Write an enzyme that holds these catalytic residues in place. Structure first.
Site, short mmCIF file in Angstrom:
data_model
loop_
_atom_site.label_atom_id
_atom_site.label_comp_id
_atom_site.label_asym_id
_atom_site.label_seq_id
_atom_site.Cartn_x
_atom_site.Cartn_y
_atom_site.Cartn_z
N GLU A 1 0.84 -1.35 0.20
CA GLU A 1 -0.15 -0.01 0.07
C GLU A 1 0.84 1.22 0.18
O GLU A 1 0.58 2.33 -0.74
CB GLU A 1 -0.81 -0.16 1.36
CG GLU A 1 -2.08 -0.99 1.10
CD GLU A 1 -3.16 -0.81 -0.01
OE1 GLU A 1 -2.98 0.36 -0.58
OE2 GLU A 1 -3.83 -1.57 -0.19
N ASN B 1 -7.54 8.74 -5.91
CA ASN B 1 -8.38 7.86 -6.50
C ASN B 1 -9.22 8.57 -7.70
O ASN B 1 -9.36 9.68 -7.81
CB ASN B 1 -9.14 7.00 -5.63
CG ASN B 1 -8.42 6.62 -4.58
OD1 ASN B 1 -8.92 6.70 -3.54
ND2 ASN B 1 -7.37 5.73 -4.92
N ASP C 1 -12.15 8.27 -8.50
CA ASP C 1 -13.49 8.98 -7.69
C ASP C 1 -13.45 10.11 -7.01
O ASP C 1 -14.45 10.55 -6.44
CB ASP C 1 -14.31 7.81 -6.93
CG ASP C 1 -13.40 7.37 -5.59
OD1 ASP C 1 -12.32 7.95 -5.28
OD2 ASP C 1 -13.99 6.64 -4.92
N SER D 1 -11.79 10.77 -4.24
CA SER D 1 -11.07 10.40 -2.98
C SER D 1 -9.75 10.21 -2.86
O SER D 1 -9.08 10.08 -4.02
CB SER D 1 -11.79 9.03 -2.32
OG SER D 1 -11.39 7.83 -2.82
N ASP E 1 -6.37 8.01 -0.73
CA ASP E 1 -5.87 7.36 0.22
C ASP E 1 -4.73 7.80 0.98
O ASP E 1 -3.82 8.28 0.58
CB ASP E 1 -5.32 5.93 -0.41
CG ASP E 1 -6.28 5.16 -1.17
OD1 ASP E 1 -7.58 5.27 -0.89
OD2 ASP E 1 -5.93 4.36 -2.22
N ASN F 1 -8.92 4.99 3.08
CA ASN F 1 -9.71 5.86 1.90
C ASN F 1 -10.59 7.03 2.62
O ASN F 1 -11.45 6.74 3.57
CB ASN F 1 -10.51 5.06 0.97
CG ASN F 1 -11.12 5.86 0.07
OD1 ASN F 1 -12.10 6.08 -0.05
ND2 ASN F 1 -10.01 5.97 -1.03
#
Ligand code: NA
Length: 129
Positions: free
Chosen positions: A35, A46, A48, A50, A52, A59
């Site tokens: 990650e 991301n 969308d 959002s 992380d 998220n």
């Protein structure tokens, strides 16, 4: 902070992740490796909208507030910047919530794609734990 592998394993163990929801410490170390590359400051946007955050790439749509993710929840009740600290307590606390949500560690796409089913105990081999 960029953690060493065994340093992270030790920190995750003290903060109660080892065998949390049946997931051995190696799973959590593997997840962090893929990650964030063990970097507490890692951020990634991301598609969308959002983002992380942190060692476990938590998220902003569901778990933390970053003020820029439209119609999202803050189920860990924390600002997303709190997940970037050298102290992993907030990330661990939130990850416990996430992994309890229903799909276990499949919530971490890198865990599913790169750790699940592999020899995850290798991630803690050689560590004083
Ligand atoms: Na949010």
């Amino acid at each position: 902070k960029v953690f060493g592998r065994c340093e992270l394993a030790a920190a995750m163990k003290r903060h109660g992740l080892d065998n949390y929801r049946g997931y051995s410490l190696g799973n959590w170390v593997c997840a962090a490796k893929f990650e964030s590359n063990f970097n507490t400051q890692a951020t990634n946007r991301n598609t969308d909208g959002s983002t992380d955050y942190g060692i476990l790439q938590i998220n902003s749509r569901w778990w933390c507030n970053d003020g820029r993710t439209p119609g999202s929840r803050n189920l860990c009740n924390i600002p997303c910047s709190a997940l970037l600290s050298s102290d992993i307590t907030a990330s661990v606390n939130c990850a416990k919530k996430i992994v309890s949500d229903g799909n276990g560690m499949n919530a971490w796409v890198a865990w599913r794609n790169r750790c699940k089913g592999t020899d995850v105990q290798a991630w803690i081999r050689g560590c004083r734990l």
